[PDB]
Write a protein that binds this ligand. Structure first.
Ligand SMILES: CCCCCCCCCCCCCCCCCC(=O)OC[C@H](COP(=O)([O-])OCC(O)COP(=O)([O-])OC[C@@H](COC(=O)CCCCCCCCCCCCCCCCC)OC(=O)CCCCCCCCCCCCCCCCC)OC(=O)CCCCCCCCCCCCCCCCC
Ligand SMILES: CCCCCCCCCCCCCCCCCC(=O)OC[C@H](COP(=O)([O-])OCC[N+](C)(C)C)OC(=O)CCCCCCCCCCCCCCCCC
Ligand SMILES: CCCCCCCCCCCCCCCCCC(=O)OC[C@H](COP(=O)([O-])OCC[N+](C)(C)C)OC(=O)CCCCCCCCCCCCCCCCC
Ligand SMILES: CCCCCCCCCCCCCCCCCC(=O)OC[C@H](COP(=O)([O-])OCC[N+](C)(C)C)OC(=O)CCCCCCCCCCCCCCCCC
Ligand SMILES: CCCCCCCCCCCCCCCCCC(=O)OC[C@H](COP(=O)(O)OCCN)OC(=O)CCCCCCCCCCCCCCCCC
Ligand SMILES: CCCCCCCCCCCCCCCCCC(=O)OC[C@H](COP(=O)(O)OCCN)OC(=O)CCCCCCCCCCCCCCCCC
Ligand SMILES: Nc1nc2c(ncn2[C@@H]2O[C@H](COP(=O)(O)OP(=O)(O)OP(=O)(O)O)[C@@H](O)[C@H]2O)c(=O)[nH]1
Lengths: 49, 320, 55, 120, 63, 139, 459, 98, 347
């Protein structure tokens, strides 16, 4: 192609990409689970409902 | 993974791969003194690879497709203008010398990286240590001013000391009048317009500072034209010398790590090639620099990081 | 006389010149260790009881 | 202000009691703005590396905003707990010291002698 | 929209901001009192804990 | 602090001699402090010229403080306006011109008039009000 | 106000990703719809300020200025692509971004509710203006211009910040509604005098007052045209607006310390006007005229009379429009001649009849020809000052006189004469600039028809 | 507040004054530093021996422990200033002033 | 230096700082200080130039003097109180001596001439380390003992730091020197706010740490040490200078950038403590810092400067050092103002 040598990131690293999405979905579903736990626990703390 | 501190911590050394056959050589001599020929002969006789003499567009060869970029974009200087009109106010000559210095600097950088990474030896046509012969020979011929010479020396001291001298260097001794006859028979009209005093001055500057100071840094092999004709004898000479002179032996793996760090970062190597000194042939103006940098950006493969330019045929940029 | 002479001299240029003049006397130290530590020494008892920071 | 409050246990983000407070909403404008900082950090990261700042490395930018929002949630919960503690210590100290918090015998402007300044 | 829009909105805004204002004043006064006297939940300063003290009979009787 | 307190004990205007002496002592103290720092950071060449430098600095500062004190007391007594901030303002130009007259410069003492007199007015205003430059932690 | 804030913020991605040719068109048109949306904000309740939310509110003083800024934003866009044609697309996009950030900060400033937030955005307008003045400037002392402008603004800004935080600790809140409804009389304490000085001098620096007005003849004269008009038209109004907000808690002290500054403006407006007469550059003349008009606004503010406030607001609006138009005309002539001395190119009335007109009513509005909003705004202040003190009139009476002189003088010495023979680059009037002066002029007479809108909160 | 404490404190004061004043050499300043350390050791030892703070007698030992470490590091610094300078004087150590 | 040796030395510096910030015994805090000092010198000597030796010396003897002084204070406190706990000083002399004993470590008082010197002599990376990590420990000790400070001494220290730092920064073209003077000014700000509310000190320290990190790693990625070399970066790489000027505006504290939030909050605190002259004084004299910030910004991005022809090859080659956490650092360096009340998390 253009570059005579292989590029530093030309073909993307399937590994690092895979961990990137894997951690991001982890952070999102942990965030959601935490929010639900906090809202229910706050509801049962002061006996609101 | 490219070599870094983590590789040394892991255990990636370079004394292990480096052997006796791992040699870095430069074949130096006068103009068309058969240095390229003899360099190739010692290359494939000793089994070592060959990087040709660095020129204007050797760096253009290093990055991307390797085609020689536009002269204006790649240092706005030409060897043909040097040969035809030597003395002019535009100062193409010192621009030529500085760009050739930096190109040979990066050539030596890549050469050092090669035999410090894979262990295969490297052969070259001239180098930094033979680069000064030209500039001094020109300056003695009423060619450039001494401010350009002092900028050259200041750049040499701060961009050559971090590197270490070659293993062996071969000199092909060809008399200057024979060189004049050779350029007569060559045919290229530009090399006709040469001062024979300039050729004699190249020869003088070679065997007055280059070879002497070389002899205290590595092993020198002075060969006459006929002596260097029979390449087998010169390769068997370079085989049997001692390979025990210079800073190459007293070179621990930690200084190996240092020199690999230096060579692997090209921007570091030529960082001091652009020191602010404001020389009449070196200061590209603000407007000229802006336009020329924009032109370099519109050139394919030079807008984004190498391996990300979509215009050139890259792919997977959105998950790269 | 007023705008470009007296108005410049009355506020902007005077302050700029003051800062220019005395930043020089602040930042022109000879860098010697002896005088630096001598100044540290003098500050010691100046803060100790000369200003009576202790009491 | 609160580093010396009795009952504090060191080196832990939320001291258990904070769950009795309403957790910050996921829609919270402070939270989404901290997510915006995640997007911005991606833009500089691509720009700092000579990349197509908008389209390059969608995963890298996506990681940036996700990371900022998570630490954003916990910081907001920590932020609200301290302000709640500030109000709790305030009013409790107010009630515990009635003499130092006098009440005012309320009267109207018809009896306040507010001087008038003629605007001439 | 009608004038009652702005009227009730200004009622709510004015009440909320007045509450904020005198709450800030109470905050300043409470902070002053608690820093001056220390008889409060915050502004407490570290002091040596008594459980470190050892009460076992030592060599010297009248320690 | 007691050396400064000497000025505080003497009411402004009255006892002009004692106030002048106290202000002269304030000036002299600042003078030897500045000269000590000067010969510390900036190296002198010998003992006698070092005395010349510190004497010049303490002379300038002592003159400044003295004339400030004299102008303040005589202005507060002559006009019977002790609370007058402008009482210190004459100490400014007195502090200004002579300081320039200590450096043999015109613009130096000309600008020193306004600068030093204005700062003198504000510090005096510190007496008039309950200002505290170094306020103890209250809240 | 987020019906105007959110579209202004979202205007940034449009320019920042638009193609190499669509940035100007898109920014101009969408800024025009933004101005159209802000035209609604002229809807004002009788006496209650429109409180959209806790942090955002508007009344009959903030709304006209906000409409002025929003309507102005297309005008820099139309005036800039002449001197910005030969630039990289990214650099042009950032210039546009600086302009949008400036307008956004001005909107949050005018609609701010707490005095601290007002201060934050008010000063925060410095940064985009600094970039515009410094990087894209063409003259020499642009680098000096930025330093002078920033330092003059800040030297007043920081004491204002200290005074505002002290007020927050003492009074309880910096909210305008609270500090007005819960306003308390101010005692004649000298600490209170310094508090008044801190609360006043920042705005008076940006007013500017005479003496400390050197940042304009060294800033507006040097900035690119877009920066020049956004400076003179609105950024000058920042100090007046802030003073109108802050004099609520600055009485009855003001009058006793109103004496120095008032006359400082009253006398100053003469000298600046005289400085206008013996000028050499068009832009400097317009800058000094702006200083004089803003000094008249200063006098209006410190009278603290209802009539004075209404005339003040009218003068701010009219002066913004007139100064923007005059700067645009000066840029047109300068670009056509690539110089700024008002002697190099004279007698261009014949060559450019529409420019000759545009200059004619630009001068007329600058000269305050009745019944233009400039004249009524001036006259209301004159009547208020006369009620406060009679002698003012002669000084006032001097001003427009000298003003009228220079108000016509440049027109005599730039178009009403004989053309210069050696110059030939004056081409046919590109309809861009003519249209631009149209969008400058027609709203001026339209507001002249119904000045009850720009009359301020006292009406 | 007893007497021997006065002598040790006064000795530390003169050693602090001596450290904060250089004349020619680098070794002399280091010696003055270790003299400061000596005064500190003697003072602390006196204090803890007098108060029968038995668990605290290790404190002068740790003082000396870090004392020797700092002295070693300082004299290695002097080794390098001698290697790049031939001598050890401080007035010629001026290359960083500009 | 062998990379493992460098890693161990960095870990020892961090462990000394941690020992300072976690120990209650005075001797242990001094031991952390000693470990920090001991492990810091080789980090400076990493590049091994005579500048490095000069700077490492000047660093050493100042820190050694400060630490010995700190022992004199600890021993006096023990003599007059009998306690090693870090609560408060029971002898006024001991504390009015440790105040400058802990000051030369920060480098704010007239005990500041060492800072520009060491900063200029040593390399840029070790300069980042010295100006960022080497200030948490003494500031932590000051925060712990803030209850019993003589306010006059500490405020005078802060004022002198601010004034001399801002003035000295006006007269240097080397980036290391003006960053050292900027660090002195920020030391003055935090130390001024220290006696009243240490939470604001922590907030200002965090903002300064992140923002100086961003500034220094931008400098490293630009490979610039003098003003002309930094100005030359526009031709090779313009985004670095573009971020440079924004980060410099944050250095000066111009809002709505992040750098205002400390300068703002500090002013809000001491005016609550009836201190009015001091906040105004600092607010006005921060303009000296701002002046050379704008001078640096002018000749870095706002005006493109004469470049060098050999940069045609420099544009040809990209960077290799990643400069981790830089894009995040810029973001917390410029836009965190709307999340200002989050400072309550520190409290
Ligand atoms: C506050 C909240 C915000 C901030 C949060 C923290 C941010 C941290 C930013 C880190 C930036 C790192 C970086 O880019 O460094 C470049 C820079 C070196 O750049 P370079 O010259 O291109 O590197 C050449 C190699 O070092 C040449 O290496 P070599 O061949 O000589 O061998 C040595 C090599 C060995 O490397 C390895 O072994 C790997 O050393 C390194 O690689 C240097 C880094 C070592 C890191 C060790 C971490 C241990 C845990 O390194 C440093 O500046 C290191 C400084 C020490 C660590 C960072 C401390 C900064 C923050 C302090 C305050 C923390 C918050 C307080 C509150
Ligand atoms: C956005 C702009 C504003 C930014 C403000 C700063 C945000 C980043 C810093 C806050 C999060 C990290 C620090 C807090 C943390 O995790 O623990 C704090 C600390 C750590 O424990 P600690 O309080 O025992 O130790 C730290 C001591 N201080 C607070 C004085 C610095 O508190 C807690 O974890 C909770 C228990 C103690 C509460 C006090
Ligand atoms: C800035 C400069 C501020 C004033 C500096 C001190 C001047 C002075 O002493 O004035 C005394 C005189 C004394 O006047 P006075 O004695 O009639 O009233 C003083 C105030 N009471 C009555 C409350 C005690 O005051 C002034 O000159 C006030 C001037 C205010 C306007 C300053 C504008 C500066 C631009
Ligand atoms: C807190 C700050 C105030 C207290 C602490 C400082 C006290 C000392 C104040 C004087 C510092 C040194 C001043 C140097 C100086 O004046 O040099 C001669 C200066 C500078 O002279 P010059 O060097 O510019 O002279 C050459 C001029 N050019 C370059 C144009 C050829 O003289 C002048 O500026 C003219 C006379 C003074 C003009 C101003 C007087 C009124 C006061 C202004 C400030 C009001 C507030
Ligand atoms: C600067 C010099 C400061 C010292 C001058 C000497 C006078 C003095 O005592 O100043 C300290 C001041 C008031 O001290 P006190 O004794 O209460 O009042 C004056 C008594 N004759 O202590 C105070 O806290 C009062 C306020 C002092 C002045 C503050 C403003 C100075 C001018 C502006 C900044 C420059
Ligand atoms: C306010 C922020 C901007 C203030 C002005 C900035 C400096 C003056 C503007 C010109 C700077 C020089 C320059 O070249 O600017 C353009 C530069 C990128 O140039 P180029 O490589 O052509 O971009 C390709 C994009 N695909 O890209 C840039 O300069 C980007 C500017 C980013 C500024 C920081 C933004 C932080 C977040 C808000
Ligand atoms: N100014 C300048 N020109 C150089 C330098 N090194 C090489 N050149 C030029 O590059 C070319 C080198 O040619 P040579 O290798 O000497 O001769 P040749 O004709 O290629 O033949 P061989 O020597 O057999 O390879 C000539 O144009 C030189 O003038 C240098 O350091 N400075």
């Amino acid at each position: 192609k253009f570059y005579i040598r292989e590029p530093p990131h030309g073909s993307p690293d399937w590994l690092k990409v895979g961990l990137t999405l894997g951690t991001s979905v982890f952070l999102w579903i942990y965030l959601i689970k935490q929010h639900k736990e906090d809202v229910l626990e706050y509801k049962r703390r002061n006996g609101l409902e | 993974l490219q070599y870094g501190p983590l590789a040394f911590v892991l255990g990636e050394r370079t004394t292990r791969k480096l052997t006796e056959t791992s040699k870095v050589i430069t074949v130096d001599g006068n103009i068309c003194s058969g240095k390229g020929r003899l360099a190739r002969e010692i290359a494939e006789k000793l089994g070592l690879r060959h990087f040709p003499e660095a020129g204007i567009h050797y760096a253009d060869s290093t990055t991307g497709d390797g085609k020689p970029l536009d002269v204006q974009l790649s240092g706005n200087c030409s060897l043909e203008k040097f040969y035809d009109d030597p003395k002019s106010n535009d100062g193409n000559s010192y621009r030529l010398q500085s760009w050739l210095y930096a190109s040979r600097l990066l050539q030596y950088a890549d050469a050092l990286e090669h035999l410090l990474s894979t262990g295969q030896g490297v052969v070259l046509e001239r180098s930094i240590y033979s680069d000064f012969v030209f500039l001094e020979a020109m300056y003695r011929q009423g060619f450039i001013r001494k401010q350009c010479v002092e900028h050259y020396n200041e750049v040499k001291k701060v961009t050559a000391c971090e590197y270490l001298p070659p293993h062996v260097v071969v000199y092909v001794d060809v008399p200057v009048p024979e060189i004049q006859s050779r350029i007569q028979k060559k045919g290229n009209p530009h090399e006709m317009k040469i001062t024979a005093a300039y050729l004699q001055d190249i020869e003088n500057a070679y065997k007055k500072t280059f070879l002497p100071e070389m002899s205290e840094k590595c092993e020198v092999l002075q060969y006459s034209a006929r002596e260097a004709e029979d390449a087998e004898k010169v390769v068997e000479d370079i085989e049997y010398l001692k390979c025990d002179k210079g800073p190459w032996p007293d070179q621990d793996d930690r200084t190996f790590h240092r020199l690999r760090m230096l060579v692997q970062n090209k921007l570091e190597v030529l960082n001091y090639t652009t020191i602010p000194v404001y020389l009449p042939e070196i200061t590209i103006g603000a407007h000229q620099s802006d336009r020329v940098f924009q032109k370099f950006t519109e050139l394919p493969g030079r807008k984004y990081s190498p391996g990300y330019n979509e215009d050139v045929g890259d792919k997977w940029i959105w998950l790269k | 006389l007023l705008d470009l002479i007296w108005l410049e001299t009355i506020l902007p240029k005077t302050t700029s010149f003051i800062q220019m003049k005395m930043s020089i006397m602040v930042s022109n130290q000879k860098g010697l260790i002896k005088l630096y530590f001598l100044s540290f020494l003098i500050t010691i008892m100046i803060s100790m009881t000369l200003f009576n920071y202790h009491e | 202000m609160m580093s010396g409050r009795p009952g504090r246990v060191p080196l832990q983000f939320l001291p258990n009691e904070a769950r009795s407070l309403p957790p910050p909403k996921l829609t919270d404008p402070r939270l989404v703005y901290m997510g915006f900082l995640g997007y911005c950090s991606g833009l500089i990261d691509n720009a700092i590396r000579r990349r197509p700042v908008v389209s390059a490395g969608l995963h890298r930018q996506l990681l940036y905003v996700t990371s900022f929002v998570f630490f954003g949630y916990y910081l907001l919960k920590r932020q609200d707990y301290m302000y709640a503690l500030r109000d709790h210590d305030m009013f409790a100290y107010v009630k515990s010291h009635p003499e130092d918090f006098p009440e005012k015998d309320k009267k109207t402007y018809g009896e306040i002698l507010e001087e008038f300044h003629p605007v001439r | 929209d009608g004038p009652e829009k702005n009227y009730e909105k200004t009622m709510a805004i004015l009440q909320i901001e007045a509450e904020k204002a005198e709450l800030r004043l109470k905050e300043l006064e409470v902070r002053r009192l608690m820093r001056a006297r220390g008889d409060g939940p915050w502004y407490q300063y570290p002091t040596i804990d008594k459980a470190l003290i050892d009460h076992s009979p030592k060599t010297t009787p009248d320690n | 602090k007691t050396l400064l307190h000497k000025y505080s004990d003497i009411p402004e205007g009255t006892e002009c001699h004692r106030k002048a002496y106290a202000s002269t002592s304030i000036g002299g103290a600042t003078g030897l402090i500045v000269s000590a720092y000067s010969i510390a950071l900036k190296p002198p060449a010998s003992f006698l010229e070092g005395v010349a430098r510190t004497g010049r600095y303490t002379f300038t500062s002592a003159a400044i403080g003295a004339i400030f004190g004299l102008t303040s007391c005589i202005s507060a007594q002559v006009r019977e306006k002790p609370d007058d901030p402008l009482n210190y303002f004459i100490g400014g130009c007195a502090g200004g011109l002579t300081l320039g007259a200590r450096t043999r410069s015109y613009g130096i003492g000309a600008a020193a008039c306004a600068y030093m007199g204005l700062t003198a007015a504000l510090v005096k205003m510190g007496q008039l009000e309950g200002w505290q430059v170094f306020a103890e932690p209250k809240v | 106000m987020l019906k105007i804030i959110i579209p202004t913020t979202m205007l940034l991605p449009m320019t920042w990703m638009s193609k190499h040719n669509m940035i100007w068109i898109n920014a101009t048109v969408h800024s025009l719809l933004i101005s159209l949306i802000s035209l609604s904000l002229l809807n004002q309740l009788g006496e209650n300020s429109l409180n959209f939310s806790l942090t955002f509110f508007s009344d009959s003083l903030s709304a006209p200025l906000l409409v002025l800024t929003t309507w102005l934003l297309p005008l820099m866009l139309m005036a800039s692509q002449s001197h910005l044609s030969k630039e990289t697309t990214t650099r042009k996009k950032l210039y546009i971004t600086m302009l949008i950030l400036l307008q956004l900060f001005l909107i949050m400033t005018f609609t701010a509710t707490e005095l601290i937030l007002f201060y934050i955005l008010f000063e925060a307008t410095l940064v985009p203006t600094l970039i515009i003045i410094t990087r894209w400037g063409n003259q020499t002392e642009r680098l000096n211009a930025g330093l002078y402008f920033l330092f003059y603004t800040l030297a007043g800004s920081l004491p204002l910040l200290v005074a505002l935080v002290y007020i927050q600790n003492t009074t309880g809140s910096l909210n305008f509604l609270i500090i007005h409804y819960w306003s308390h009389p101010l005692s004649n304490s000298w600490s209170n005098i310094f508090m008044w000085l801190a609360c006043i001098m920042a705005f008076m620096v940006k007013m500017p007052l005479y003496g400390l007005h050197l940042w304009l003849p060294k800033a507006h004269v040097e900035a690119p045209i877009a920066g020049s008009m956004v400076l003179a038209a609105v950024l000058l109004k920042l100090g007046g607006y802030g003073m109108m907000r802050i004099t609520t808690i600055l009485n009855p002290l003001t009058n006793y310390m109103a004496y120095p500054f008032l006359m400082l403006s009253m006398w100053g407006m003469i000298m600046t006007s005289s400085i206008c007469l013996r000028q050499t550059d068009l832009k400097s003349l317009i800058a000094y005229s702006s200083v004089s008009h803003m000094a008249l606004v200063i006098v209006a503010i410190m009278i603290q009379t209802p009539w004075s406030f209404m005339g003040a607001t009218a003068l701010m609006i009219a002066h913004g429009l007139t100064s923007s138009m005059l700067f645009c005309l000066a840029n047109t002539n300068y670009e056509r001649v690539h110089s700024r001395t008002m002697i190099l190119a004279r007698g261009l009335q014949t060559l450019l009849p529409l420019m000759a007109t545009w200059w004619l009513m630009a001068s007329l509005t600058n000269l305050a020809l009745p019944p233009s909003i400039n004249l009524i705004g001036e006259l209301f202040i004159i009547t208020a000052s006369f009620s406060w003190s009679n002698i003012t009139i002669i000084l006032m009476g001097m001003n427009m006189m000298i003003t009228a002189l220079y108000s016509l003088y440049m027109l005599i010495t730039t178009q009403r004469g004989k053309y210069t023979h050696h110059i030939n680059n004056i081409k046919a009037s590109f309809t861009r600039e003519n249209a631009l002066m149209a969008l400058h002029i027609l709203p001026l007479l339209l507001l002249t028809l119904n000045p009850k809108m720009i009359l301020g909160p006292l009406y | 507040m007893p007497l021997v404490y006065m002598n040790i404190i006064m000795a530390f004061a003169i050693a602090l004054a001596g450290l904060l004043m250089y004349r020619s050499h680098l070794m002399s300043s280091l010696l003055c530093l270790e003299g400061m350390m000596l005064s500190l050791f003697i003072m602390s030892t006196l204090i803890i021996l007098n108060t029968h703070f038995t668990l605290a007698n290790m404190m002068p030992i740790i003082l000396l422990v870090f004392a020797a470490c700092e002295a070693a590091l300082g004299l290695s610094l002097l080794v390098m200033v001698s290697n790049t300078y031939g001598t050890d004087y401080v007035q010629n150590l001026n290359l960083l002033q500009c | 230096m062998n990379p493992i040796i460098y890693t161990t030395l960095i870990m020892t510096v961090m462990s000394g700082t941690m020992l300072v910030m976690i120990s209650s015994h005075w001797l242990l805090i001094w031991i952390g200080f000693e470990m920090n000092l001991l492990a810091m010198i080789p980090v400076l000597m990493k590049n091994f130039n005579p500048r490095a030796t000069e700077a490492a010396t000047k660093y050493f003897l100042t820190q050694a003097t400060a630490s010995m002084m700190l022992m004199m204070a600890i021993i006096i406190n023990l003599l007059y109180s009998g306690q090693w706990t870090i609560t408060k000083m029971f002898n006024p002399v001991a504390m009015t001596m440790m105040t400058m004993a802990l000051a030369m470590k920060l480098g704010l008082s007239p005990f500041h001439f060492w800072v520009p010197e060491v900063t200029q002599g040593i390399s840029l990376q070790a300069g980042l380390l010295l100006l960022t990590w080497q200030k948490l420990a003494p500031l932590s000790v000051l925060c712990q003992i803030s209850q019993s400070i003589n306010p006059n001494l500490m405020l005078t220290m802060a004022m002198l730091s601010i004034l001399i730092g801002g003035w000295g920064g006006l007269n240097q073209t080397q980036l290391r020197k003006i960053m050292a003077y900027s660090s002195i000014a920020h030391m003055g700000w935090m130390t001024a706010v220290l006696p009243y509310n240490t939470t604001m000190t922590i907030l200002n320290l965090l903002i300064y740490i992140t923002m100086t990190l961003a500034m220094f790693m931008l400098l490293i990625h630009s490979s610039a040490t003098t003003t002309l070399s930094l100005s030359h970066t526009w031709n090779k790489m313009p985004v670095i200078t573009s971020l440079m000027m924004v980060t410099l505006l944050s250095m000066g504290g111009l809002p709505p950038l992040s750098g205002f939030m400390p300068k703002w909050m500090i002013i809000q605190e001491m005016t609550k403590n009836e201190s009015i002259i001091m906040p105004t004084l600092m607010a006005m004299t921060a303009l000296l810092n701002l002046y050379f910030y704008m001078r640096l910004a002018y000749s870095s991005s706002l005006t493109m400067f004469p470049s060098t022809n050999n940069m045609k090859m420099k544009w040809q080659f990209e960077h290799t050092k990643q400069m981790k956490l830089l894009p995040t650092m810029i973001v917390l360096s410029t836009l965190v103002l709307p999340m200002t009340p989050a400072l309550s998390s520190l409290n």
